[PDB]
Design a protein around this ligand. Structure first.
Ligand code: FAD
Ligand code: FAD
Ligand code: 4P5
Ligand code: 4P5
Lengths: 327, 327
């Protein structure tokens, strides 16, 4: 049993990891190799601030599975090398809207008192809550090391095709190709959703602030997310846009929006800045297909890959076990 | 006159700025575009620690042009913006060797003394001199800034060939594709010299230390070049290895190597870790070739492209002014 996971963001490495935790004891030899053309810190996953938060329905179970999972680890000392921690903060809107499904997964969820709404002249409604953050860059790095302990080998290649990989002699292929899955098997329902962010030095920001606006659309209005080192600013989401390139208006839009939202930001040193492509699909593709060869796809996580990736991996891992059960 | 520059490393952006800096006041209009599929922080450039030093005809001159031009700007306000500063430290050898030809270009060149030579107890000899560091990341940003205020537009684009660009409307194509040059036109002299590095936190390190040993060969023994915010630990050179993926054996090699050079780094926290491809050629190809259309080649700067970039950039400008005349 010779497995090739293609892809090395959060999705591809969790999966590999899950599959190894659960299966290596049960065969005989389990050989897993990962193929990506990009490793940290050059993946979409390296540009996510990594806040846990879904969109405003197995996907709910999955996110939640990942929340209970990370949380059960936040007060361990692996947590640091994971870049895992807890953070509170605001969601802000113009109009009233219903509580989300994750109401009760996050900690201490509630509506904002008028006095807390007094500080954001521009918003009429909000939530406060405690969530948690997984920095992509460290996460990816921790995953890397845990894989490398479990003797899992990496290779840098662009895979042109699944046949490429079956002919080398994979029995099982796991496609974790994020936004790039179309290149391998066509997907009219996968589109990139271009994001941009800046990293600024603002170590007094201890809260996340996310704003929402119906005309702007999802992930397209100011947000501010404190990290371990820098505070992440962003609020760019443009469907169908494949330019891996920082752009000047986006920079401004981010800067003006973020400073307006939080004037104190005006003196924060810009540290760096980056673009990525959220794998937008109306729904994560997470499912088996036969080629003689077996394929588990697991892409189309859009703007919530960190939030969900571990229910996905545990789910990809039952698919892997359902296969062997047919052998 | 339609001008297209391929590459956003120090070479392309350099030559670009420098071409525009010289001929914007004569044509009428000079329309300049940059096409690259990779920009900061994913070029080979953002990988260099950026320390000025050639090996041990024309390139000699180009290096000293680059070094003088950086010295003329070392005490200016934009040095910080540029990521440029003075640094001294050591070159350590097993045997005596001839003085290098840039002896008089760097400042205060000298032979190490007995007391100094007692500090590296594996090395019978070397030099101390004062040099400068031009930090790879900061520099490209600075350059993108100059080019952008200047109206040079950038596009994210893997160019599949010269004609495709030719057929758009380009009069001059400037070829700055580093190690990939050979994909646009076969060049069997040009090869990868993979290096890996780590960036550590050791801000008590105020000197560079280059070691050398022909029995490992070029860039293939330990080195410690301090930067603005961290210190680069290196010593890896692999001819023909095309794996962009940090390697654990190479990690150990650099780690063990430097902590032996400089025992003090065993307590240094590891910040990050990068692989790049040095465009290794027996010389820089910087020459004209007509394909119809005009092509200036500027690529193959091995492991001293920041050391030499302004010179080559000056020479590529020149070649450009000559193309005008003919037209
Ligand atoms: C600006 C921005 C902010 C974000 N913030 C958050 C956040 O706060 N919280 C959260 O939960 N999510 C966030 N996300 C969403 C999240 O970052 C992504 O949904 C998720 O990382 C995608 O993971 P992936 O592993 O599927 O893709 P990637 O990390 O992009 O990895 C896909 C891998 O597949 C490889 N690959 C593709 N094609 C091939 C090929 N043919 N051959 C070999 N390898 C191939 C690629 O090299 C890469 O290694 C954000 C996204 C963006 C853009
Ligand atoms: C570990 C390491 C340390 C180094 N340290 C130093 C140092 O201290 N001092 C020093 O002087 N030098 C150092 N160097 C050498 C230096 O990094 C290189 O000489 C220099 O970066 C080369 O710059 P570039 O413009 O040639 O190529 P690159 O940085 O690689 O830029 C090439 C560009 O062209 C693009 N491209 C290529 N083909 C196409 C195409 N078909 N279509 C569109 N775009 C294309 C790429 O995406 C990229 O943007 C170091 C190198 C390494 C690997
Ligand atoms: O811009 C984004 O993709 C984004 C920001 C953010 O905060 C929590 C989840 C999330 N996604
Ligand atoms: O590793 C390299 O390629 C490299 C190291 C170094 O120190 C001065 C120039 C230079 N290049």
């Amino acid at each position: 049993m010779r497995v090739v996971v293609i892809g090395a963001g959060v999705i591809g490495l969790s999966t590999a990891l899950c599959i190894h935790e659960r299966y290596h004891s049960v065969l005989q030899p389990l050989d897993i190799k990962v193929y990506a053309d990009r490793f940290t810190p050059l993946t979409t996953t390296d540009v996510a601030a990594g806040l846990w938060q879904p969109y405003l329905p197995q996907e709910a179970d999955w996110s939640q599975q990942t929340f209970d999972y990370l949380l059960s680890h936040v007060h361990s000392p692996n947590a640091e090398n994971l870049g895992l921690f807890l953070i509170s903060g605001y969601n802000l809107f113009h109009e009233a809207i219903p509580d989300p499904s994750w109401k009760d997964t996050v900690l201490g969820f509630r509506k904002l008192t008028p006095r807390e709404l007094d500080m954001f002249p521009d918003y009429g409604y909000g939530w406060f809550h405690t969530s948690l953050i997984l920095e992509g860059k460290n996460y990816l790095q921790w995953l890397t090391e845990r894989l490398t302990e479990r003797g899992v080998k990496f290779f840098q290649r662009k895979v042109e095709s699944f046949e490429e990989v079956a002919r080398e002699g994979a029995d099982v292929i796991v496609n974790c190709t994020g936004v790039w899955a179309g290149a391998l098997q066509r997907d009219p329902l996968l589109q990139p959703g271009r994001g941009q962010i800046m990293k600024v030095d603002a170590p007094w920001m201890k809260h996340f602030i996310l704003t929402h606006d119906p005309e702007r659309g999802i992930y397209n209005s100011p947000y501010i997310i404190p990290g371990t080192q820098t505070v992440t600013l962003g609020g760019i989401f443009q469907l169908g846009n494949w330019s891996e390139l920082n752009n000047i208006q986006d920079h401004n839009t981010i800067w003006e929006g973020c400073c307006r939202l939080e004037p104190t930001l005006k003196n924060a040193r810009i540290i760096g800045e980056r673009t990525g492509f959220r794998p937008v699909r109306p729904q994560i593709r997470l499912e088996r297909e036969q080629l003689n060869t077996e394929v588990i796809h697991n892409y189309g996580h859009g703007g919530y890959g960190l939030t969900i990736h571990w229910g996905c991996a545990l789910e990809a891992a039952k698919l892997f076990g359902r296969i062997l059960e047919e052998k």
